[PDB]
């Protein structure tokens, strides 16, 4: 019976809520009331990477913390030498509307996708000299929004269609399909252990998945509107999501609640891209009001502003050595920020 | 600056030159976005002028025009319509004979007209299937005033310039269907964008010239607003 099933679902939800409430013995704000706050952090735009013709949608660092790929509505994926602001490749794309890009851990491949329901994989180190498409991944029924390489042969995608996918590049099939969400998946971050990953999907819900088993493990429902970004804390036991309700929250995969809630009442604009520093002490988040802010993770104090972008920041990534932080925005620029001593 | 770094700088400069050529081509192109419904006959106008995005190419008076019909996508648009900021115009094709769906058409149009990222984007209405509308009221079995009560107090506006061979009631209804959209448009916009009504049938072919004229008009108006002669 539909009524009986609904009653059982309500009872299960109430039991889950009670179990979640039980384990909340103490709050992060109470524990951090004694930890020393960090001083005002200032970063001063060491480099500016010009060359895109329109808005920048996504960017990704290489595992060497020196190379850099950027996707724009132009139809380009430029790989930059961040140290010298050079340009090593300029990849002409097939569809002008790309909402994501990624850099393979080995440096051999890059990925890109957008409204065309395809994750295109580009091979960078060819015997013929130029860059070429190695594989187009086909099955989705909605705009691709984030792709992240695991190995040189396995990639994971997230689509507007209520589905994430795990592909096998050499063949071109969906080895496992994730079918738990109701809305549009907007963000996707891979845990450092490379066995689990998370996503927020335009329904105030964040869901951790298992790459091997293929079953949604947890389901966090703390927000009020669409989730726009997600990012694993370096431990692999947390993640942070910024949403259209102008709020960031920290979720822990074990506790199964929200730990903190990053909200300044003066902020009415939403959140678009979230990355972390290396120690996890810094939570950098792009906002629609033309700037990015450097939140404090443990203490939850708005302890930095990155105000140099003339338009809305849309992407934000931090290197693997924690020595550079890069932002791109709808002003067609890509600024590589760093601290000063 | 070692020899290999100098050659790397040389390669970056060549990439920059190619990017400048691409930038010339990019500014020389005006982009559009074809919105509508399943029965709107938007594809019919496409015939005249898992793939998630289609693309139509057409040239009028040696000016580039890209039209991006949205294909295999779901119902919701609250996220991928953000991608069409910085677009010259939006084309909204409306069916004028499905009175029981015109209200849903308006309810989509008002959201499109009030979207935050579409707050500087003009819309070119192509009210389609006017010939199919003709019979609906001519051999009238269905009354518009049922779905729309305010058809009572309304009458034909003076500025109407119908072609010969029209029932005055036909014109009064047709311009009313034209007028609710304009009522929606004039409510908000702060003069930053405007709506351009047109009446289109499947046989009309000047749809490219009309887009040419309205895009030129939109650019003229934004330039005249920043110069403040407007």
């Amino acid at each position, epitope marked *: 019976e539909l009524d009986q099933l609904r009653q059982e679902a309500e009872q299960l939800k109430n039991q889950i809520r009670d179990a979640r409430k039980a384990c909340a013995d103490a709050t992060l704000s109470q524990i951090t009331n004694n930890i020393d706050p960090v001083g005002r952090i200032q970063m001063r735009t060491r480099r500016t990477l010009r060359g895109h013709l329109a808005k920048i949608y996504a960017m990704h660092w290489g595992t060497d913390s020196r190379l850099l790929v950027s996707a724009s509505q132009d139809g380009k994926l430029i790989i930059w030498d961040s140290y010298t602001t050079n340009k090593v490749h300029a990849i002409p794309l097939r569809s002008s509307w790309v909402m994501t890009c990624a850099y393979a851990p080995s440096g051999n491949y890059v990925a890109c996708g957008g409204l065309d329901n395809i994750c295109s994989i580009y091979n960078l180190k060819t015997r013929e000299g130029n860059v070429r498409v190695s594989r187009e991944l086909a099955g989705h029924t909605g705009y691709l929004s984030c792709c992240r390489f695991l190995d040189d042969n396995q990639i994971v995608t997230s689509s507007g269609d209520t589905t994430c996918a795990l592909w096998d590049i050499e063949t071109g099939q969906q080895t496992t399909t994730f079918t738990g969400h109701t809305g549009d998946v907007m963000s996707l971050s891979l845990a450092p252990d490379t066995r689990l990953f998370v996503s927020g999907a335009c329904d105030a819900s964040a869901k951790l998945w298992d790459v091997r088993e293929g079953m949604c493990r947890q389901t966090f429902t703390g927000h009020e509107s669409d989730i726009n970004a997600i990012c694993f804390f370096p431990n692999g036991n947390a993640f942070a999501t910024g949403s259209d309700d102008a709020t960031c929250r920290l979720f822990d995969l074990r506790a199964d609640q929200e730990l903190m809630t990053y909200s300044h009442d003066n902020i009415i604009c939403g959140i678009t891209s979230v990355s972390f520093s290396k120690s996890g002490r810094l939570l950098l988040a792009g906002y629609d009001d033309f700037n990015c802010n450097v939140w404090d993770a443990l203490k939850a104090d708005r302890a930095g502003v990155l105000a140099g972008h003339d338009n809305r920041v849309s992407c934000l990534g931090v290197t693997d050595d924690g020595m550079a932080v890069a932002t791109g925005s709808w002003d067609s620029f890509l600024k590589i920020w760093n601290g000063s001593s | 600056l070692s020899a290999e770094d100098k050659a790397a700088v040389e390669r970056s400069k060549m990439i920059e030159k190619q990017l400048q050529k691409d930038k010339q081509v990019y500014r020389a192109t005006h982009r559009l976005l074809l919105l509508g419904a399943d029965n709107s006959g938007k594809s019919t106008i496409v015939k005249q002028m898992t793939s998630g995005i289609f693309e139509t190419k057409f040239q009028v008076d040696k000016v580039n025009f890209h039209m991006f019909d949205v294909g295999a996508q779901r*119902d919701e*648009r*609250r996220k991928w319509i953000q991608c069409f900021n910085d677009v010259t115009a939006i084309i909204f094709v409306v069916d004028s004979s499905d009175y029981n769906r015109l209200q849903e058409a308006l309810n989509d149009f008002k959201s499109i007209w009030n979207n935050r990222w579409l707050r500087t984007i003009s819309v070119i209405l192509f009210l389609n299937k006017q010939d199919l509308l003709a019979e609906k009221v001519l051999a009238g079995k269905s009354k518009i005033e049922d779905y729309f009560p305010e058809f009572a107090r309304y009458t034909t506006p003076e500025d109407a310039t119908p072609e010969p061979g029209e029932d005055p009631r036909v014109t009064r209804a047709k311009y009313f269907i034209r007028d609710e959209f304009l009522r929606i448009s004039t409510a908000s916009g702060d003069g930053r964008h405007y709506c351009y009504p047109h009446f289109t049938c499947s046989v009309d072919t000047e749809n490219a010239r009309r887009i040419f004229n309205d895009c030129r008009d939109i650019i003229q108006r934004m330039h005249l607003r920043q110069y403040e002669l407007l």
Partner: nanobody
Amino acid sequence: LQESGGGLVQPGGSLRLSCAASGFTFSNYKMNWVRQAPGKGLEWVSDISQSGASISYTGSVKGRFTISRDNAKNTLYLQMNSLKPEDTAVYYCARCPAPFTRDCFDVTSTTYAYRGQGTQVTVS
């Protein structure tokens, strides 16, 4: 959104639909009333903004049904006086996707997140 408060009523009867809102910053969201009839899809009906002063109707219920807001109690209302056999439908209480915005896109979509369970209302 626990939508309830309706049911069977005679033609020309009176009903007061209720939209139990639970924890989404009630006083910052545009809200709508959407009903789906047998053999038909979804359709917007009424609209009240966050200020309780902006209203909009369809025309089929324009002079007959009135929408209202209850910020203190976090509740939405819809008053019924003059039903007719064209109103036989389930009723859904909708919420605008983003806060502090004047645009609501996907309220009548086939699948939507911020919508109520549904309340049955039938005319005999």
